Scaffold this active site. Structure first.
Site, PDB file in Angstrom:
ATOM      1  N   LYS A 184      28.512  54.399  81.320  1.00 56.76           N
ATOM      2  CA  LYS A 184      29.400  53.523  80.520  1.00 56.76           C
ATOM      3  C   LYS A 184      28.565  52.315  80.087  1.00 56.76           C
ATOM      4  O   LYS A 184      27.509  52.069  80.695  1.00 56.76           O
ATOM      5  CB  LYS A 184      30.599  53.053  81.338  1.00 56.76           C
ATOM      6  N   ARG A 185      29.022  51.596  79.071  1.00 60.74           N
ATOM      7  CA  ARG A 185      28.345  50.364  78.615  1.00 60.74           C
ATOM      8  C   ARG A 185      28.160  49.439  79.825  1.00 60.74           C
ATOM      9  O   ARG A 185      29.008  49.452  80.764  1.00 60.74           O
ATOM     10  CB  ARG A 185      29.107  49.767  77.428  1.00 60.74           C
ATOM     11  N   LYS A 199      32.716  46.034  84.583  1.00 60.14           N
ATOM     12  CA  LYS A 199      32.569  47.456  84.990  1.00 60.14           C
ATOM     13  C   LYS A 199      31.814  47.531  86.325  1.00 60.14           C
ATOM     14  O   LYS A 199      31.805  48.631  86.954  1.00 60.14           O
ATOM     15  CB  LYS A 199      31.864  48.230  83.872  1.00 60.14           C
ATOM     16  N   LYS A 231      36.919  62.372  81.539  1.00 58.62           N
ATOM     17  CA  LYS A 231      35.934  63.404  81.256  1.00 58.62           C
ATOM     18  C   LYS A 231      35.434  64.005  82.567  1.00 58.62           C
ATOM     19  O   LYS A 231      35.291  65.216  82.686  1.00 58.62           O
ATOM     20  CB  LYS A 231      34.773  62.861  80.417  1.00 58.62           C
ATOM     21  N   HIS A 274      43.389  47.300  72.814  1.00 60.72           N
ATOM     22  CA  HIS A 274      42.452  47.997  73.735  1.00 60.72           C
ATOM     23  C   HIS A 274      41.924  47.100  74.860  1.00 60.72           C
ATOM     24  O   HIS A 274      41.233  47.633  75.733  1.00 60.72           O
ATOM     25  CB  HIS A 274      41.267  48.567  72.956  1.00 60.72           C
ATOM     26  N   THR A 302      37.992  56.150  79.512  1.00 55.83           N
ATOM     27  CA  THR A 302      38.063  57.579  79.117  1.00 55.83           C
ATOM     28  C   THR A 302      36.966  58.403  79.784  1.00 55.83           C
ATOM     29  O   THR A 302      37.158  59.627  79.883  1.00 55.83           O
ATOM     30  CB  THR A 302      38.053  57.699  77.597  1.00 55.83           C
TER      31      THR A 302
HETATM   32  O1  LIG Z   1      41.050  52.508  74.451  1.00 56.25           O
HETATM   33  C1  LIG Z   1      39.667  52.877  74.347  1.00 56.25           C
HETATM   34  C2  LIG Z   1      38.782  51.974  75.221  1.00 56.25           C
HETATM   35  O2  LIG Z   1      38.680  50.715  74.552  1.00 56.25           O
HETATM   36  C3  LIG Z   1      37.789  49.816  75.232  1.00 56.25           C
HETATM   37  C4  LIG Z   1      37.634  48.550  74.353  1.00 56.25           C
HETATM   38  C5  LIG Z   1      38.480  47.521  74.446  1.00 56.25           C
HETATM   39  S1  LIG Z   1      38.060  46.345  73.356  1.00 56.25           S
HETATM   40  C6  LIG Z   1      36.743  47.205  72.780  1.00 56.25           C
HETATM   41  C7  LIG Z   1      35.937  46.769  71.796  1.00 56.25           C
HETATM   42  C8  LIG Z   1      34.965  47.620  71.255  1.00 56.25           C
HETATM   43  C9  LIG Z   1      34.145  47.186  70.218  1.00 56.25           C
HETATM   44  C10 LIG Z   1      34.284  45.888  69.711  1.00 56.25           C
HETATM   45  C11 LIG Z   1      33.460  45.450  68.670  1.00 56.25           C
HETATM   46  C12 LIG Z   1      33.604  44.154  68.168  1.00 56.25           C
HETATM   47  C13 LIG Z   1      34.567  43.286  68.699  1.00 56.25           C
HETATM   48  C14 LIG Z   1      35.390  43.725  69.735  1.00 56.25           C
HETATM   49  C15 LIG Z   1      35.253  45.023  70.241  1.00 56.25           C
HETATM   50  C16 LIG Z   1      36.081  45.467  71.274  1.00 56.25           C
HETATM   51  N1  LIG Z   1      36.673  48.395  73.418  1.00 56.25           N
HETATM   52  C17 LIG Z   1      38.377  49.494  76.645  1.00 56.25           C
HETATM   53  O3  LIG Z   1      37.516  48.571  77.334  1.00 56.25           O
HETATM   54  C18 LIG Z   1      38.584  50.802  77.473  1.00 56.25           C
HETATM   55  O4  LIG Z   1      39.306  50.569  78.699  1.00 56.25           O
HETATM   56  C19 LIG Z   1      39.385  51.807  76.658  1.00 56.25           C
HETATM   57  O5  LIG Z   1      39.423  53.071  77.379  1.00 56.25           O
HETATM   58  C1  LIG Z   2      33.516  58.483  76.894  1.00 56.13           C
HETATM   59  C2  LIG Z   2      32.378  57.618  76.584  1.00 56.13           C
HETATM   60  C3  LIG Z   2      32.403  56.227  76.799  1.00 56.13           C
HETATM   61  C4  LIG Z   2      33.566  55.509  77.428  1.00 56.13           C
HETATM   62  O1  LIG Z   2      33.381  55.522  78.880  1.00 56.13           O
HETATM   63  P1  LIG Z   2      34.168  54.506  79.842  1.00 56.13           P
HETATM   64  O2  LIG Z   2      33.714  54.940  81.225  1.00 56.13           O
HETATM   65  O3  LIG Z   2      35.649  54.684  79.613  1.00 56.13           O
HETATM   66  O4  LIG Z   2      33.685  53.112  79.521  1.00 56.13           O
HETATM   67  C5  LIG Z   2      31.290  55.512  76.468  1.00 56.13           C
HETATM   68  N1  LIG Z   2      30.184  56.071  75.943  1.00 56.13           N
HETATM   69  C6  LIG Z   2      30.141  57.380  75.711  1.00 56.13           C
HETATM   70  C7  LIG Z   2      28.896  57.948  75.126  1.00 56.13           C
HETATM   71  C8  LIG Z   2      31.220  58.195  76.029  1.00 56.13           C
HETATM   72  O5  LIG Z   2      31.122  59.536  75.787  1.00 56.13           O
END
Ligand SMILES: OC[C@H]1O[C@@H](c2csc(-c3ccc4ccccc4c3)n2)[C@H](O)[C@@H](O)[C@@H]1O
Ligand SMILES: *Cc1c(COP(=O)(O)O)cnc(C)c1O
Ligand SMILES: OC[C@H]1O[C@@H](c2csc(-c3ccc4ccccc4c3)n2)[C@H](O)[C@@H](O)[C@@H]1O
Ligand SMILES: *Cc1c(COP(=O)(O)O)cnc(C)c1O
Lengths: 809, 809
Positions: B541-542, B547, B653, B350, B649
């Site tokens: 988004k986070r 970002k 949406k 990811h 994602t």
């Molecule tokens: O594929 C679903 C989405 O995954 C996000 C994405 C990548 S790594 C990550 C993540 C999330 C939670 C985590 C908790 C602990 C350690 C590493 C982690 C990495 N989240 C990506 O940043 C997005 O681009 C992507 O749309």
């Molecule tokens: C869809 C969604 C995300 C992911 O959004 P990105 O713009 O791809 O980072 C994060 N948080 C919530 C609550 C969502 O519904």
């Protein structure tokens, strides 16, 4: 099947079966091909709970409309046991549910065994709270039980190499279908902080907040359609609590620890902070709930609308908390607030053993509850001002009566606080209540004689006869009808059947049936083989030096030595069963269990003894094991040193269920012997007066050892390693205590106990005269109903009239 | 009311109303006079859950009889949000429940707002797991989601003085009616211990045991009567655990801490022991469950019956655990066990951000999982033996490809383990999957080109259109029917309505309705007043540097400075809304939130600006707030530096819900622009190739500051305290990072971003051409359905055929 279990009408059975299958599908999300017996138990529990709901809602509505005086029973312990069978009994659903489950190819008795005990108590005091809730619902009182929802109740006892091992009682693991969470009635409780004095009075500030979330359990009365509430508080952290991030979330467990575990000490005070927190937690949340209900009807009418009964001193902080709310938050002046507190609160004392009395160090209260300590000091000053005015010059009386004890560490005497802050103080049997007025509370009695009462303890004949002994309930109901189940005095009608051959036959047959069923239970669940034609000699109760399981051990070894001396002589065969838990830190109680199992290891494997003498330690004694063993018992051992057992309630359970009693003139034994006749009771040993005489000249155990050869032999066997061959010195602490440090004078009662036990064996040889004496006991057990006890509390303490009238269904 | 919400037949409405009143009485133990809106929500939730149960039982039975290949989706995160509306949508019960509740005088929409989000995820990865479960149920796959039941999900965000404050998300406080506890399927998980080598192979001994108790949540497919299972594990201590007494019971909390709280880091690795415990816990319990189900149908057929998909590396220990079970417990030889592992496991990557890659210190694995470390070393040796044979002499390749990283502390590269142990490795958008093959996994691609795939992410059009935007769903369904809801490609039929006046009017009307409803929501819940005729410029988004919420901040300040320069000139009015959570320990993300609120404090209170520019920080962004704001949005900000957002994602949406996108050629933005046409997308900024060129010669931010007067003014305003008058230096860390340490090249994209934002304002001035461009976006959003994504996983990775056929009801 049997009449007292109610009707199984075609409509009722059809409807129960339909709702059973509805809960199995919708509630448990199971089809019949994957369901375990546990799913079947849950489906039935949900089905029976459904019949409670209408009555529970209507009863709570009835109390809102009628607005009667409300009884608040505050206890740190409710020893409830299992709920399923009790609910069925009180709703007359038992035969219908038996029929309904039978037609689905299930055995209801097998499903009943899957329910966990709610073991939220240690012993007598916790079980007395449970019996009381049952009687209050049966007598139509607007009564609420208030306590703590412990995540872990009294520990499960395992025996490993003859030693007690404790396991966590994870009673909520599979869910509790009887409780309803009420997270919307969540209340804040405060701890720590400090006191600011403003122009506008004292302010308790900078506190830590714990939330109290209530769980409501229905308490059904006996076929009167009344369902009262037991409300138990659970500790929850607020969501800003500690709020690096991860650790702040994990630290929420510090606050939730308050409701985690029941302190497993019976008649022993341990001054631990966590225990003081549990005490304040249940008091603070409960008093807010009481006041909220009172305002949803000026505090002059509070005592006309509220009674608060304190189950020992455990919730004694109710008195300063009520003062704190009335003075600090509602702005009543001291004297008015105090009038209201005293007229609202009543105190039940349960022991005279000094190690059981709550004496909280001042440094603990100063840190945790600084405002309550200020109010306690103020209460003490005004109280000692009344003592000085009544007994001018008696400075020693002032020291003795103080709520504050001087010494190494200053302590608060919580019993002194309860007497000062209560309009009524009762003991729990006549001899106990007399001892309170003569010795430990003599000074308080001389100041306020009007406060001191007796309320002799009792047991609910629903759980303790109809539920555990249906066979006995039925043969009684055949002759005198069913009314006695809620009017136990009617059992006196049985005295006119003492010479009836058929009734003698039936009483003996039920006893035999109960013994066969219990002998089979031992074989299945614990692979042990007992002679069901032997006398069932049963001592079940918490392991304590004052209850003198050791005296029983001395008798058992005496029988063993007599058989070995004269192997070819006839003796009445006995199965000696001793059961109970020791407090985990009570070394001596743990050694006594080990002695019991060590005696069994010698006695049960001696080929010369045969099936003439068996010694069984009954593992994990709890309410559901009491329901099985007590109906099976022939002889009830109630052998506490005179003056130590405040009442006892096991004694009463056995009297009701067709066992003869061997006992001292202690606690309710005295009133039981008076009710039945001394000639129908195996009384032995020192009376209270004899124990006092022994204390004056001094107890020398050596004298008994020197004069009783049978006793010397037992003590030499203990010392030499007869009972512990691999560890010859294993029992040196027991021998040492008996010879030099015995507070409970085991040797002083030995000769009279053994002689009295010979009279028991002699009467057992004559089945007809044994059974006639049993009938005289059952027939006179009516006084020992908790319905009598609660009617006495209602009229003489709470100022409310009991009622046996049905609410509409 | 609207057709896509299904029928409200008289029988259905009558039956729902009856079951609502049955649950209110029997389940909630409430009459209508004391019920709160929360009771009403629970009564409705129980009523709708009842319709799931039959389908859930039949679906699980169907999979037992047919025995298809089983898909196990392993994730540490499932971002589910609310369940009530989603269940009603998928069962066609929404209009019937609307009607039923209306007739009881209740507003269903008010009851829906009482449900807590299941916030068991951080963002995109957690929400992708939730969308996937929905698509797998809709495509009739025998699929199980496996995760952790966290007591506390993603923290609730409060803004206090413009700063983020975290509160515990106590989502289970009031109960979760959607889950079913299965305490009978409780499984042991082992930790610590040591390895004995016997004659009969290696033995993992002296372990600590934690129990895994599963909770099952139903996952309904879209009107196909399929209900799949999400199984989440809860940590429970065994009852002999620590078993002085009191403290042993309290210490049970150490073991239960494993399932207590979700780690709140998005795209950031924190090597904490508790996190490694969570990873092993879900893997160990899940693999035992999988194997148990497989044996209840020789391990050659295992990969024909089991697919295990790894949601990133978080459950990478599935690979060594499967080897451990197959080698140590089932006694397969290494090579056979390995064949089975590789053919069973597939890995979804990811991110490319190196701080997001899991690299566990060896000392942690050595202590916690000594046997897994041995198996990982063995895997590494055999893997590097294949690398050496393929690339003889390439010693640098051996170092780069090793599962074991040398350095200060030895670490395990969990991504390297997943590639070695998996038959398929996919990225989550085409550009991301190309970057994996070109850069970070180039060596692995050269060894095993066949393993590497693309599976472009998607969103479920059930939650993300029908549920959150019923008005849009309906005007689409008016023209092209309802089939598109489970076949989103059918939205292309809308391209023939791009010149239809009525459809243009309806699309614009729904957008206006959504904006009015959201503007009112802001006023009620957060007392803020926005112009609903402004352009809704939304970045949700986070909070992350990659970002580039900061780039958005620079645009907002540019608009402010332009208005103040020329106050009397017309500008398209905008409401700029930025929302998202920062990880609690991510200082820079916390400073960015504070900058957003500090800009708002200047901009929203400047009388010269008027309602021409509003800057709103949307508090507590979560799935239920996304459902409200996304349908209200005009402009979607997808402005990550090219190469950093693997997919995104949120982008999808917004495309589905009638917002135009301003974005970089990053992640799925590339494929979205390709689907709609570049002319219907606001693309700006460096491509990946341009970022690489900037890295080669070096990024000097000073160059941009020196050459762009508009940018210099903003940086001087930040530094001087224009936005923080009381604390002039408040934002010195932000200015300092932008000028000297900007990994994400915010200034490099500034000029092109601002110019592209002018093109957006220009098109917004022409409502008809804005709406025609929106229609071109909605009409081409079909590719971005998770049904397409899951059908691609099913055919190209799992080897199963999706089906749109109904099970019988
Ligand atoms: O594929 C679903 C989405 O995954 C996000 C994405 C990548 S790594 C990550 C993540 C999330 C939670 C985590 C908790 C602990 C350690 C590493 C982690 C990495 N989240 C990506 O940043 C997005 O681009 C992507 O749309
Ligand atoms: C869809 C969604 C995300 C992911 O959004 P990105 O713009 O791809 O980072 C994060 N948080 C919530 C609550 C969502 O519904
Ligand atoms: O009245 C009910 C029964 O109460 C018993 C009784 C007295 S004190 C006590 C007790 C029980 C639990 C306790 C926990 C912590 C501190 C002190 C405690 C005291 N239990 C008495 O010992 C019995 O005689 C009596 O029948
Ligand atoms: C009744 C009862 C007690 C109290 O028995 P005593 O002999 O009065 O000490 C203790 N434990 C259980 C389980 C009981 O049912």
């Amino acid at each position: 099947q049997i009449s007292v279990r109610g009707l199984a009408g075609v409509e009722n059975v059809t409807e129960l079966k339909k709702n059973f299958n509805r809960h199995l599908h919708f509630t448990l999300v199971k089809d019949r091909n994957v369901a375990t017996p546990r799913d079947y138990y849950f489906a039935l529990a949900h089905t029976v709970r459904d019949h409670l709901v209408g009555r529970w809602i209507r009863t709570q509505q009835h109390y809102y409309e009628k607005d009667p005086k409300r009884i608040y029973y505050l206890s740190l312990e409710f020893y409830m046991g299992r709920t399923l069978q009790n609910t069925m009994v009180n709703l007359a659903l038992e035969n219908a549910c038996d029929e309904a489950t039978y037609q689905l190819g299930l055995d209801m008795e097998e499903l009943e065994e899957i329910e966990e005990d709610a073991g939220l108590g240690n012993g007598g005091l916790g079980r007395l709270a449970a019996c009381f809730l049952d009687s209050m619902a049966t007598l139509g009182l607007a009564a609420y039980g208030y306590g703590i929802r412990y995540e872990f109740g009294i520990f499960n006892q395992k025996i490993c190499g003859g030693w007690q091992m404790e396991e966590a009682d994870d009673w909520l693991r599979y869910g509790n279908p009887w409780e309803k969470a009420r997270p919307e009635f969540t209340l804040p409780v405060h701890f720590y902080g400090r006191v600011e004095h403003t122009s506008q009075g004292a302010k308790w500030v900078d506190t830590q907040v714990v939330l109290a979330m209530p769980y409501d359990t229905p308490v059904p009365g006996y076929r009167n359609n009344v369902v009262n509430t037991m409300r138990l508080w659970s500790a929850k952290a607020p969501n800003d609590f500690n709020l690096g991030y991860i650790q702040a979330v994990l630290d929420r467990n510090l606050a939730e620890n308050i409701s985690r575990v029941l302190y497993p000490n019976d008649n022993f005070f341990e001054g631990k902070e966590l225990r003081l927190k549990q005490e304040y937690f249940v008091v603070a949340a409960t008093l807010q709930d009481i006041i909220r209900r009172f305002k949803s009807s000026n505090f002059d009418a509070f005592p006309d609308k509220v009674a608060i009964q304190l189950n020992d001193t455990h919730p004694s902080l109710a008195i300063p908390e009520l003062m704190r709310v009335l003075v600090d938050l509602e702005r009543l002046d001291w004297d008015k607030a105090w009038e209201v507190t005293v007229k609202t609160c009543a105190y039940t004392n349960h022991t005279v053993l000094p190690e059981a009395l709550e004496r909280w160090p001042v440094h603990l209260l100063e840190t945790l509850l600084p405002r309550h300590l200020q109010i306690i000091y103020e209460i003490n000053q005004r109280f000692l001002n009344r003592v000085a005015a009544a007994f001018p010059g008696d400075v020693d009386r002032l020291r003795r009566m103080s709520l504050v004890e001087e010494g190494a560490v200053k302590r608060i005497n919580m019993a002194h606080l309860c007497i000062a802050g209560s309009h009524a103080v009762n003991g729990v049997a006549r001899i106990h209540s007399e001892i309170l007025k003569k010795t430990i509370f003599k000074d308080f009695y001389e100041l306020e004689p009007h406060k001191f009462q007796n309320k002799t303890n009792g047991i609910t004949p629903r759980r303790w006869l109809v539920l555990c002994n249906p066979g006995l309930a039925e043969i009684i109901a055949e002759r005198i009808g069913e009314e006695y189940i809620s009017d136990l005095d009617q059992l006196r009608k049985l005295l006119s059947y003492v010479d009836d051959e058929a009734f003698i036959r039936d009483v003996a047959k039920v006893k035999q049936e109960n013994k066969l069923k219990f002998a089979a239970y031992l074989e299945r669940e614990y692979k042990v083989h007992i002679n069901p034609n032997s006398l069932f000699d049963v001592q079940v109760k918490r392991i304590h030096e004052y209850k003198r399981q050791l005296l029983n051990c001395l008798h058992v070894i005496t029988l063993y030595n007599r058989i070995k001396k004269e192997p070819n002589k006839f003796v009445v065969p006995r199965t000696v069963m001793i059961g109970g838990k020791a407090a985990p830190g009570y070394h001596m109680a743990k050694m006594i269990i080990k002695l019991i199992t060590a005696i069994g290891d010698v006695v049960n494997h001696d080929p010369v003894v045969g099936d003439r003498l068996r010694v069984i330690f009954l593992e994990n004694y709890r309410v559901s094991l009491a329901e099985k063993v007590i109906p099976a018992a022939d002889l009830s051992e109630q052998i506490s040193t005179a003056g130590t057992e405040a009442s006892g309630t096991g004694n009463m359970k056995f009297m009701l269920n067709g066992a003869l009693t061997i006992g001292t003139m202690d606690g309710a034994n005295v009133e039981m012997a008076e009710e039945a006749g001394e000639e129908n009771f195996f009384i032995f040993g020192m009376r209270v007066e004899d124990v006092d005489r022994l204390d004056q000249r001094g107890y020398n155990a050596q004298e008994y050892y020197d004069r009783i050869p049978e006793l010397r032999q037992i003590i030499e066997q203990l010392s030499s390693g007869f009972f512990s061959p691999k560890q010859p010195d294993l029992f040196k602490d027991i021998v040492n205590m008996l010879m030099h440090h015995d507070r409970f004078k085991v040797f002083a009662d030995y000769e009279e106990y053994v002689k009295c036990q010979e009279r028991v064996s002699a009467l057992y040889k004559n089945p007809r005269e044994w059974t006639r004496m049993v009938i005289r006991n059952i027939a006179t057990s009516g006084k020992f109903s908790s319905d009598r006890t609660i009617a006495q509390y209602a009229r003489e303490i709470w100022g409310v009239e009991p009622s046996r009238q049905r609410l509409p269904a």
